[PDB]
Amino acid sequence: AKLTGPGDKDRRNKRKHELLEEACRQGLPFAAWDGPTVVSWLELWVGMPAWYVAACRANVKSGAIMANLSDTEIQREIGISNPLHRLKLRLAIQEMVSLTDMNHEWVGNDWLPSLGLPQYRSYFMESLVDARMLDHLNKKELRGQLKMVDSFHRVSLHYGIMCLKRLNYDRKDLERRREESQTQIRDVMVWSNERVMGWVSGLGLKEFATNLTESGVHGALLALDETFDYSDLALLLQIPTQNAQARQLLEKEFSNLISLGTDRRL
C-alpha cells in the first residue's frame, strides 16, 4: 500500500484496542456502556457488517438491552436472521460480560486449509465463523449451513477443534510447534495437511501425496482418532487395492509415525 489512511488494517486494529482500553480504563461494565459505545464495539471488535450495526444504532440504546436481548429479539432489532451470525453475537456479548487473534478470516484462510479442508472456506467465512464458535457448532449447522455432508470431514473437523483445545487456542504456540516438527517425526498432533503430505512423499510415495488435498487429513486426526488406521489413509490416497508394496510401506511407516509421534494404542 503506497497510500496510508484510517482505513488500513493496523489503523482499525489499534483503534479497536484503544476503544477497549478506554472501556476498561473508565471502569464501565458491559451493561453500563452507551449507545454509541456498543455500536463502535459492534463494528470494531465483533466485526459485524454495516447493516447489522445500523439496526443496532437505531434499536439498542444501552449494553443492558443488548445483553438481555433474546434470540428472537436479536432477529428483529439488529436484523440478524442468520443463526451462526447470532451465535457469533451471543458468544461475543457473553465473553465481554464475563471479562468485565483468531477470527473468521484466520479460520478461513489459515486453519481450515491446514486441516485439508479448504473447500469449506466460503461457507465458514460467509457465516462469520471465528475460533470461539467452533465447539458450539451443531450437527445441523455443519450439515446444512456449512455444507459438511461428508461425515468424515465433520470428524476431521472435530479432531481439529480438539487439538485447538489441547493447545488452549494459542495460535502462536500452534505455529511454533508446527515449525519445530517439520523435519522430525515427533508430535504429529500439530501436523498440517502439508506436513502430512510432506510425510507421505518422504516415504517414497510422492505420486499419492497430492490426493490428500481437500481430503480432511491432518495430524490431529491421525493422532487423536483410534479408529483411523493405515487402510483408511490408504484409500484416501486412492491407493490401488492390488498394490501390495505400497500398502506395506504405508502400513509399516504409519506404525512408525503413530508409535514415535503420538500416544495412540494402535
Binding site: 496510508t4 482505513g7 457488517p49 454495516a50 436484523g79 473468521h104 466460503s122
Partner: protein
C-alpha cells in the same frame, strides 16, 4: 514503409500497408533481410543439441550469450540465447527460449553472470494443454538450480501480469542480488492479441521498474523469437518515439534478424507491432500520481488554445476514437434478449450459458466478462434483466458462481423500465431449474441489500446470493458527490472479502454500460490509487471498452469518475 516514419504519418502508412488484403504488408514483411550469412556451430554440437527447445531455432555464434566454462564439462558455455540491440542501446536485451528442465541452472547462471535485474516472461506455463515453458522459479521458498540459489521473496498478481521478486545467491560467494520477473498473462493461445492495450500497459510497467544501471534485460517465451521479438521491438520503438517522434519498425526488425533468427516470426505479429505503436502514438500519456490529481483535473476543465471544448471532453472523445464483433447478439433467435437492440456483448468476451438441447441461442445472454485490478473475469457487466431473460439471468449467476449482484438503477425511472423485478419479494418463486427464497432485506441510507437462498431443483444444492441495490443515483445526470457511491463500492467489495466469495461480481444498470462502467472503473481506479498511488482514468476506461462496448457512456459520467477519485483521495493522510 521500408524506413523511418514520423508518427503523424503512421496511421496513414498502416492503412496503405493494409489495403488490398494487406498486400503491401506481406511484401514488406517478406522482404526483411539481414543480407548476410551466420554460423551456429555451438548450437549444433552434440552436447548442446538437447539444450535447444526447437532444433530449428538456434543461437548465432557472433551474438550468442556465452556463459563461463565449467572445468571438465564440455558445452558449459552454451545457452540458447542472443543479445539484441535496443534503441541507441547495445546488447540491451537478451532473447532466450523458455528454459528446459535441464537448462534451468544455465538460465539462472546467465542471469547472474550478465548482471540482469529484470526477466520478462511472455507466456503462461501451459496454453491449451500444450507445454510452452517449464516453471523455473520456486513456487515457495528457496530452490537450487545448478550453482544459483533462487529465493522467492514476493508475488503480486494483477489481471494481465504477475510480478515476482527473487533474491539470488551463487555458491561460493556471499554476494546477494535482487531480481524481478514480469510474466505476461494476456497473450491468447492462438494468434496475436485482439487489442494492444494490455501489452502496452505491461511494457510501461517494465520500463518503470527496470533499473537504468543493470545488465541486459532477459526476455523469453517459447523459442524466444515471436512474442519475445514483439516485446523488444515495441519497447525500442516506444523509446525512439519519445526521442525522435518517428519509428523504423522495418529497420529495427532487420537489425534484430542479424542477432537472432526469426525475430518476429509471423506477419500478423509484424502487423500487431504496428498497431500497438499506433495506439501509443495516439493515446499519449495519461497517468498522474495522486500528488498531482487536483491540478490535473483543473487542467482538464480548461479549453486548450485553438480548440472549442475542454480537455476533458477531448479526452473522452478519444476513448471512442480507437475503433463484425456482435455475432451471437444479432442472431434472430437472440435479438429479443437484448434490452437495447444496439447494445450488445463482444463475441470474444461474452458470458456463455450451457446450451440446452434443441433450443437455438440458449447459450446467450447480454453479458460480458470484465477484468478487475487483480484478476480477469472479476466482473460480469450485463443489462437490466428483462422478464424474458430472468430465467437466464439466474442461470448465469449459478453457472459462473456469482453470488454478489450489484443493481445501479430503480425498477422504473422517468416513467420507463430500467430493470425487471427478477427477484421474489414476499414468497418463493421458481425460475425454470431454480428456486429463489427471500431471506432478508436491509435498508441503508443509499442502498438496499437483499439476500436470497437459491436452490438448484435438479440436485438440491443451494447458495446464498446477495444483491446490493444503489438507490441514490439521480434520474437525471450524476451525483454531485461520490461520497455515497464510493462507500457503496467499498461495502460491496468488503462483503466479497469478508464472506470469502471467490466468484465474479455481477453488475447491471439498464444497458449495462453507463453506470456499470462508472461502478467498475472506480472499483479498479480507487484500489490502484490506494496501492500504487497513481491514477490512469483514460487507460482504465479504454481497457474496459475492449471487453464491452461503450463503458462509461457519457462525459458527465467520466467527469464523475475523476471527481470521485479526488474525493477518495481526500480521505487519506497526506491529503
Amino acid at each position: 514503409h521500408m524506413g523511418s516514419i514520423p508518427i503523424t504519418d503512421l496511421a496513414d502508412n498502416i492503412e496503405r500497408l493494409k489495403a488490398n488484403d494487406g498486400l503491401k504488408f506481406s511484401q514488406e514483411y517478406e522482404s526483411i533481410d539481414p543480407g548476410q550469412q551466420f554460423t551456429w556451430e555451438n548450437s549444433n554440437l552434440e552436447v548442446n543439441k538437447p539444450k535447444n527447445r526447437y532444433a530449428n531455432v538456434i543461437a548465432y555464434d557472433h551474438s550468442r550469450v556465452i556463459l563461463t566454462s565449467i572445468d571438465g564439462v564440455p558445452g558449459s558455455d552454451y545457452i540458447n540465447a542472443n543479445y539484441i540491440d535496443g534503441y541507441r542501446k547495445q546488447n540491451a536485451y537478451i532473447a532466450t527460449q523458455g528454459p528446459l528442465p535441464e537448462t534451468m541452472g544455465d538460465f539462472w547462471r546467465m542471469v547472474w553472470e550478465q548482471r540482469t535485474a529484470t526477466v520478462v516472461m511472455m507466456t503462461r506455463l501451459e496454453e491449451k494443454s500444450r507445454v510452452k515453458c517449464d516453471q523455473y522459479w520456486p513456487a515457495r521458498g528457496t530452490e537450487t538450480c545448478g550453482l544459483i540459489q533462487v529465493t522467492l521473496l514476493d508475488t503480486v498478481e494483477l489481471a494481465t501480469y504477475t510480478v515476482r521478486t527473487f533474491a539470488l545467491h551463487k555458491s561460493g560467494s556471499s554476494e546477494k542480488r535482487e531480481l524481478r520477473q514480469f510474466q505476461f498473462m494476456a497473450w491468447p493461445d492462438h494468434g496475436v492479441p485482439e487489442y494492444p492495450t494490455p501489452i502496452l500497459a505491461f511494457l510501461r510497467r517494465v520500463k518503470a521498474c527496470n533499473p537504468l544501471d543493470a545488465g541486459p534485460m532477459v526476455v523469453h517465451c517459447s523459442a524466444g523469437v515471436g512474442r519475445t521479438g514483439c516485446f523488444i521491438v515495441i519497447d525500442a520503438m516506444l523509446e525512439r518515439m519519445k526521442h525522435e517522434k518517428t519509428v523504423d519498425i522495418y529497420g529495427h526488425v532487420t537489425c534484430m534478424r542479424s542477432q537472432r533468427n526469426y525475430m518476429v516470426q509471423t506477419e500478423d505479429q509484424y502487423v500487431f507491432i504496428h498497431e500497438a505503436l499506433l495506439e501509443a502514438a495516439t493515446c499519449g500519456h495519461t497517468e498522474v500520481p495522486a500528488r498531482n490529481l487536483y491540478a490535473h483535473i483543473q487542467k482538464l476543465g480548461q479549453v486548450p488554445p485553438g480548440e472549442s471544448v475542454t480537455a476533458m471532453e477531448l479526452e473522452f472523445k478519444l476513448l471512442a476514437s480507437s475503433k463484425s464483433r456482435f455475432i451471437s447478439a444479432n442472431l434472430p433467435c437472440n435479438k429479443f434478449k437484448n434490452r437495447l437492440v444496439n447494445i450488445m456483448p463482444y463475441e470474444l468476451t461474452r458470458v456463455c450459458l450451457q446450451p440446452i438441447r434443441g433450443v437455438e441461442g440458449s447459450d446467450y445472454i447480454n453479458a460480458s466478462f470484465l477484468d478487475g485490478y487483480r484478476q480477469q473475469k472479476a466482473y460480469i457487466a450485463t443489462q437490466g434483466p428483462l422478464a424474458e431473460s430472468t430465467e437466464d439471468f439466474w442461470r448465469m449467476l449459478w453457472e459462473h458462481n456469482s453470488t454478489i449482484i450489484v443493481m445501479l438503477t430503480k425498477l422504473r425511472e422517468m416513467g420507463r423500465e430500467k430493470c425487471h423485478q427478477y427477484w421474489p419479494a414476499e414468497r418463493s418463486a421458481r425460475y425454470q431449474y431454480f428456486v429463489v427464497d427471500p431471506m432478508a432485506e436491509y435498508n441503508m441510507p443509499q442502498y438496499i441489500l437483499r439476500e436470497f437462498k437459491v436452490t438448484d431443483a435438479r440436485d438440491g444444492q443451494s447458495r446464498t446470493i446477495r444483491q446490493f441495490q444503489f438507490t441514490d443515483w439521480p434520474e437525471q445526470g450524476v451525483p454531485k458527490t461520490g461520497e455515497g457511491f464510493i462507500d457503496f463500492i467499498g461495502q460491496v467489495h468488503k462483503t466479497k472479502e469478508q464472506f470469502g466469495q471467490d466468484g465474479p461480481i455481477t453488475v447491471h444498470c439498464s444497458a449495462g454500460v453507463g453506470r456499470t462502467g462508472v461502478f467498475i472503473t472506480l472499483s479498479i481506479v480507487l484500489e490502484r490509487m490506494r496501492y500504487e498511488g497513481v491514477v490512469d482514468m483514460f487507460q482504465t476506461v479504454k481497457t474496459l471498452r475492449t471487453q464491452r462496448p461503450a463503458m462509461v457512456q457519457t462525459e458527465d459520467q467520466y467527469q464523475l469518475c475523476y471527481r470521485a477519485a479526488l474525493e477518495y483521495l481526500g480521505s487519506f493522510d497526506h491529503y
